[PDB]
Amino acid sequence: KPIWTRNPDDITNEEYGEFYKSLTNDWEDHLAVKHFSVEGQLEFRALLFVPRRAPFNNIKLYVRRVFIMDNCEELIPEYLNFIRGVVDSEDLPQSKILKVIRKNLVKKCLELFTELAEDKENYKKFYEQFSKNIKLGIHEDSQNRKKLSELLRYYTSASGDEMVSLKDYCTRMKENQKHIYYITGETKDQVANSAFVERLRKHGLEVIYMIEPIDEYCVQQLKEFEGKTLVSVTKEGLELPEDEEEKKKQEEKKTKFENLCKIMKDILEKKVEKVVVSNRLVTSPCCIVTSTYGWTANMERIMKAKKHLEINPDHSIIETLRQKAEADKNDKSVKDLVILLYETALLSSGFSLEDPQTHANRIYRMIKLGLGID
Amino acid sequence: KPIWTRNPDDITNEEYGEFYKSLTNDWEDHLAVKHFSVEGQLEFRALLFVPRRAPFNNIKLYVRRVFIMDNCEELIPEYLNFIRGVVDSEDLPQSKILKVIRKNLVKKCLELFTELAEDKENYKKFYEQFSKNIKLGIHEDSQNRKKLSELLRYYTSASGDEMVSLKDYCTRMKENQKHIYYITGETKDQVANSAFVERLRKHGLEVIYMIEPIDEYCVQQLKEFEGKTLVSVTKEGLELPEDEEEKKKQEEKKTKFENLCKIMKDILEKKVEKVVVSNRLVTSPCCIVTSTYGWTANMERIMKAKKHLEINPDHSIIETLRQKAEADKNDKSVKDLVILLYETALLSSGFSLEDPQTHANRIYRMIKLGLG
Amino acid sequence: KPIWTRNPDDITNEEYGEFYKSLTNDWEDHLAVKHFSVEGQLEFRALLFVPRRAPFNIKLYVRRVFIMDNCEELIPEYLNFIRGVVDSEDLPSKILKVIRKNLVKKCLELFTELAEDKENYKKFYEQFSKNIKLGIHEDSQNRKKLSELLRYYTSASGDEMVSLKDYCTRMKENQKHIYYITGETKDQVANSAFVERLRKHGLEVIYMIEPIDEYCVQQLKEFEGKTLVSVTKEGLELPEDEEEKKKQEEKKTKFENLCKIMKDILEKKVEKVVVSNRLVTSPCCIVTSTYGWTANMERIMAKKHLEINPDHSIIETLRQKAEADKNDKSVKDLVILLYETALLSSGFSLEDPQTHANRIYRMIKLGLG
Amino acid sequence: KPIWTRNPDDITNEEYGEFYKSLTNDWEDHLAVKHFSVEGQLEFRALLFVPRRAPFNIKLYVRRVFIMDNCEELIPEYLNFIRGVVDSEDLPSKILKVIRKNLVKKCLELFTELAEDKENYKKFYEQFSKNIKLGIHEDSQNRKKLSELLRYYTSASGDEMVSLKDYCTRMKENQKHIYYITGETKDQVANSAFVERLRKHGLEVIYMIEPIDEYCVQQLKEFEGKTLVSVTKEGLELPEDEEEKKKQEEKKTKFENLCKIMKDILEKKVEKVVVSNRLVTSPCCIVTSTYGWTANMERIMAKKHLEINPDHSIIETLRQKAEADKNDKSVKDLVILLYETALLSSGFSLEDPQTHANRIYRMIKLGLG
Amino acid sequence: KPIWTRNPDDITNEEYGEFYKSLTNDWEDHLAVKHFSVEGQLEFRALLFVPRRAPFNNIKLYVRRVFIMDNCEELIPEYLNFIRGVVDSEDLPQSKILKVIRKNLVKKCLELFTELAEDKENYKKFYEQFSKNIKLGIHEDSQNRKKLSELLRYYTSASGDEMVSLKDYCTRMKENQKHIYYITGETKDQVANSAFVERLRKHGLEVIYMIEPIDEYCVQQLKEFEGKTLVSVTKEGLELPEDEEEKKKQEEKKTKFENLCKIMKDILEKKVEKVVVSNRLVTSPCCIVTSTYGWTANMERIMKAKKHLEINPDHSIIETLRQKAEADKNDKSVKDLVILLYETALLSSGFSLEDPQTHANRIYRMIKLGLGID
């Protein structure tokens, strides 16, 4: 009799929808249904629904077609709490059999979501509602992390205005390419045009643009996809596919600017840990990166710390400032220029001036020069 | 028999303290105590305590020595909800009886606070903990707003590392000074060294440093004190005491840069409503102020805006800029300059930029100029 | 797609009702519906229903997503019979009050349209007048709009209940005050001694005969200028001639001797006695000060003034009969008899109803031997 | 080591109190303490305290481990002023009742010892008599032990309140019933018409002058055999001579004519009138049936019988004065006057207190002209 | 000022005890105190107490010496909920920093418990109150399972009436001994005298006697100690240190009784999965064991299934019944004897007869023979 005891092949979409509206006092029908039964260990039937709109535990529990409760937070994990429906156990009596029901429900929900994905138009419709939940699942459900990660969709430097899957990112990977590059910030345009992605983008190396704050917490646990390790492009020591000749070309620029690097680190005092030669810049003269362990600019923005300033070996500014500096180490104008570079990189790398008026003053002095005063 | 029924001369702080710790399960004793009896139309008895530490309403109510309840909506308003103690009514056979109690408690609490504000040592302990509540009450409680305002203490451009009262501010007001000037920002240093206070500081017109967030909510309601209106130093049209001579000197500068203001506004088009000759700057070449009607940069940052660019007529950058722009109002370089100045002033005024990359690129183009 | 976001002029009463019943689990449909929207400030839509029967809340939506029902501060407590939904566009403490003020605005709007159609205002008012009155008591900003919904029986009005607007159309040129009385029965108050001279003068009196009425008029102080006055309390202003103003003077001194001598021999029982201008056929009545509790106030659980009738035979006799030779158990027997009888007639309880009953037994014992 | 497992004879009142105060957050110590143990069936210990002031529960331990305080069924609701601890040895629905019955046994034991010491029973009884009475009402198994704790004012007892045991020592040989009255004041009930003949006969009457009393006596039906009877209700048994039994017959027929003719002209107001054996000096009173609500029952919010006094002058006159020629506005005026006066004297309210007050105004108007 | 902010070296035991009684309205003082502070990541001080008696979350939370709450079930795991005390954070503002506080509290509680253990008289006093909690911890706190397992104490066939640690069990292990043997049942005597332990005990191989029901749930997750894997002696395929000669002696008894094993399995029909030759019996003629995965006799007793009947190669009864049976396979008296053996093993191995009267009848027939009737 009750709808969850009928054979799925029999029940129609109108029928389900009606049951759903009736179960949830929702004004519209479900977005997706998953309706199944498990055998042997425990016997149970389940009818699960995905709402059209994300809510701002509530599976109804039955035994032998008799209502028990629905406070049962043990049936599904926090992150799938948007799921709604009934579980009809063919008899439960410790109390942990509930774990076995939970695992099945997650199995099937993940199965449902995969199927939604294979419908490539209108996975949009689920994903724009529930990707926060996916991502939250990746953080805290280590057992299903891999499956959950196949459901993610992102903007990438290759994707234009489409969100693409990690699987697709992988099939486009280059040859010596060993790593999945990502960036986290507030906007697609803000990251696309960032100093950190200039060189990857010039060489056709694809960057995932993670542009929602949950992403910060998500990448914390998403270490890898298809055995390729995910690397942040705003952290120290960006590693990128090396040629037998670039690795030599690098160490050659490294010891070239080793000197200027040492004088720069000297005056920048305790504002920066290291001053290294960059491997991620083309047009931008320098940038600020943060240590492998630590807080990013995006994270300090959410907080409402170990910096490295990377210089660009091939930028005229840096290049000439290597002349000036090795000519006169303690020179008062190199000093204020070094800070001004630093201060500029700070801003354009997502950070926030310790004192913005001293920075203002620094600009003022410079433009006073510009206009030919002093 | 119970302590609150005893006569306040016969009770010692050691005894009051012991009661308080019993009452509230604290590990330390109270900071202050008010034990009073209202006699007359409705007689009742109250023993009130201020804690030494602000907690993360909570008054026990008794009728004729018999406990009734403690979760009592509107025995005191929310802003005084830190007070703890008991009220023992001598007669009771939701109502309007509670209004009488509520007014009495609120009088005596404000009484206690004024008293505490002698003994300067101890007011520091109280205010350090409960400044927020005093302010929260100025916003909500109009019947008491003036008493609440005399309890306020602030860091000012005159005061050093001590915080002073509004009364004291007033004792130092100049001649022809009609306004109390305040700035609101994140830190004392930030505000004390903001472009907005340069000239007030030079003339020795005191400025109040408002550096807590509640202050933004608070001055929304503290309109004036002791007949003198409070004015923000970051909003348009800063009025100053100005001698007959100086006014004539300010008017010359207005028309001398009447032209530069015009061309600057044209270039800055959509980003600025008005550019004006400043009266508030000395060392800085310009700053950004917000329309009187609109809302600030301190406020924009607390969410977790009509602008004026004021320009310093006595500044080398500005006096040089006049010359260059009047020589060619279309010089792409004058333009690049103006936008630089605008961006830098925007940063200096607590605003965040539209696109910190383009601003950075500007800087770079420049620092590549003065180098080859 | 949901009903509250559909255009109100498309939606029919069977649909509203289907929705109402479905929202509330009522078996009968709603009694009134108000479906409006708001713009500018804060855009939102509301669908509010008035149930047919008094009880003893509101579903809040943001962008068509359910948030909560409980929401303690959406309508004020006196309008909590109202069921419905509010759907907000832009809502991400201080702004709920913006919603609360609009919802109340449109409820009162609804109630005013409801009042226009008499052949059915009855159905509303019988059920929720208590709420209106509780409204006047607790809500100051709308006290005025709320009192125009009040309906009362009056001296002028027989079996119907009329409005204060209505009362006012019937006021007389000189009349500055709206006169009311509080009691337990329509009959009881209409035949009371207080109304007599007012009625004789053609000045309408409102019969307030719910207990709630006693609590409501604490705060309802005026209407269209005019101030309200109980007829059971000391000091009653009454439009007076230059002629009658001269004549009310006569009595307050002719009977002043009696007024000094009557309270003299009634102390502990009643405190001060004056000439009464509210009396025609009755010889005395107790009025109840201004601070002091009234006979109907005290009932739902002190300060009595005896007012005697100048032009009454009983009073005129008992004047000169007392004035010369101020004693004998008989002059005392009647003065006590006037107090007690006046005290029951004004709706009070004698401490001992034997001291009164035995007195009737003395009066009846020598009515025949 | 904890106090409730220590031997009661070691532990001092300062310790009990220190414990009590610490248990309850009272500022003053306990008023009574009962510390007992139980064996056999189910071993357990209890420490129970009686607070000095009435409120407006019990910590349960098993093997010295805390379980819960709330425990809804440890003492019955009427004994919920009692604070304390119960510590059980063997407790691993049906057995809590075994504890509940023992705790009540020892509470009543405590209250009985409390009553032995008069120079302090006052302190208990003033505070918790309401609870005792609520006990009689709800707890049948202990109704008897509970009524021996009841203390009342009586006709016989002046300014003191006595027990029913005490009442019984003063009963007369022939007396089968315990007579009580319910009213609002001691004075009010002692001077009431109902008590007159009982008092004259030397039969003690209990003055029950709390409202709660009205509710309590619903279920308190007897004591030491003797049954209780209200003096404000129809049919009052009274020890009678062979002589007086013959004489009460005279009146019930002499006045039967009047009894037929009096109810004839009082219908809607009162239903049936008989000769009264509760009256001496008063001429009439209303009694209130057996089903029907009484004047004091109706007060905390119908079926009245007029009982007239045979040996009264007013009644004897009004007999033959009516019998021959049964009319004139005067015979009616007095019969109505007897009803109303009898109705206020019995503690009722007239529908309109003007119909009565005007009648006094007719009687007084020709008491002098 | 407050006791948890004072230096432990300063506060006395009387002082702590008093604070404790006052914090818990407990009539007696604490059994143990642990009082510490953590630095850097978050700063906080904590004062934790162990009660004398097991209760039938309640750490009080403070920030900058200001009370916050105590419902905070995130501060310690279910199984340590008997712990009572205060946590004073030097400022907490997501909300998951709580995890970092939790880990510290568990670290320290486990540290406390270890110290209690090193006091070898009067660890009794903690352990008899809280071993259920230890064991519950082993089930569900996989990260600390190893440390938690060092706290366990058991009766063993070697220990007499002392409870001993797994570490001690290990230092007594034999030479080819690779495994920690245990048995679960209701009583020390019931397990000591069980058929399953006869041979281990004859050879000096030590058996842990697990005699509380939580043990059943505990061994479910306690796979190993010091790299030695725990094996149940009531399960199929007891493996025991093999000599170059016993392994041969076994396979020799195996094929000897291979025949009788097949006829026995034949009549015992679907009551038993296998009938094998035993390797755990000396005096007892046979016994019932249950499959590696499955339910034990003890577990079916808690439920208010795959059996193997092992025969004893050296028991006269079995030995002669191998003669009788290979002489007459389908003989009616061998049949009823085979069941009677089975039925007896069922009872003495913790199980419960499907039909006890048919068993009774079986005995009756036998004793009717005994008395010489039939």
Numbering used by the authors:
A (entry chain B), E (entry chain B): 294 to 349, 359 to 395, 405 to 615, 630 to 699
B (entry chain A): 294 to 349, 359 to 395, 405 to 615, 630 to 697
C (entry chain C), D (entry chain C): 294 to 349, 360 to 395, 406 to 614, 630 to 697
Task: List sentences quoted exactly from the publication behind this structure.
The N-terminal truncated HSP90 (MC-HSP90, residues 293–732) containing the middle segment and carboxy-terminal domain was crystallized in three different forms, C2221, P21 and R32. For the C2221 and P21 crystals, obtained under similar conditions, the protein solution was pre-incubated with cis-dichloro(ethylenediamine)platinum(II) (cis-DEP) and cisplatin, respectively, before crystallization setup. The other crystals, the C2221 and R32 crystals of MC-HSP90 and the P6322 crystal of MC-HSP90-Ct have fewer than six molecules in an asymmetric unit, but they also contain this kind of hexameric assembly in the crystals, suggesting that the hexamer is not just a result of stabilization by favourable crystal lattice contacts. In the absence of the N-terminal ATPase domain, co-chaperone and client proteins, MC-HSP90 structure contains several disordered regions, which correspond to four functional loops: an amphipathic loop (residues 347–360), a middle segment catalytic loop (residues 395–406), an extended loop (residues 616–630) and the C-terminal tail (residues 698–732). To confirm the presence of disordered loops and C-terminal tail in the crystal, the C2221 crystal was harvested and dissolved for in-gel trypsin digestion and MALDI-MS analysis. However, in the catalytic loop, only the residues 395–400 could be identified by our experimental procedure.
Heat shock protein 90 (HSP90) is an ATPase-dependent chaperone and the molecular chaperone functions as a dimer. The conserved HSP90 structure consists of three domains: an N-terminal (N) domain that contains the co-chaperone binding motif and an ATP and drug binding site that binds the natural compounds geldanamycin and radicicol; a middle (M) domain that is responsible for binding to co-chaperone and client proteins; and a C-terminal (C) domain that contains a dimerization motif, a second drug-binding site, and a conserved MEEVD pentapeptide at the C-terminus, which is recognized by the co-chaperone HSP70/HSP90 organizing protein (Hop). The structure reveals a hexameric assembly with triangular bipyramid geometry, in which the building block is a dimer.
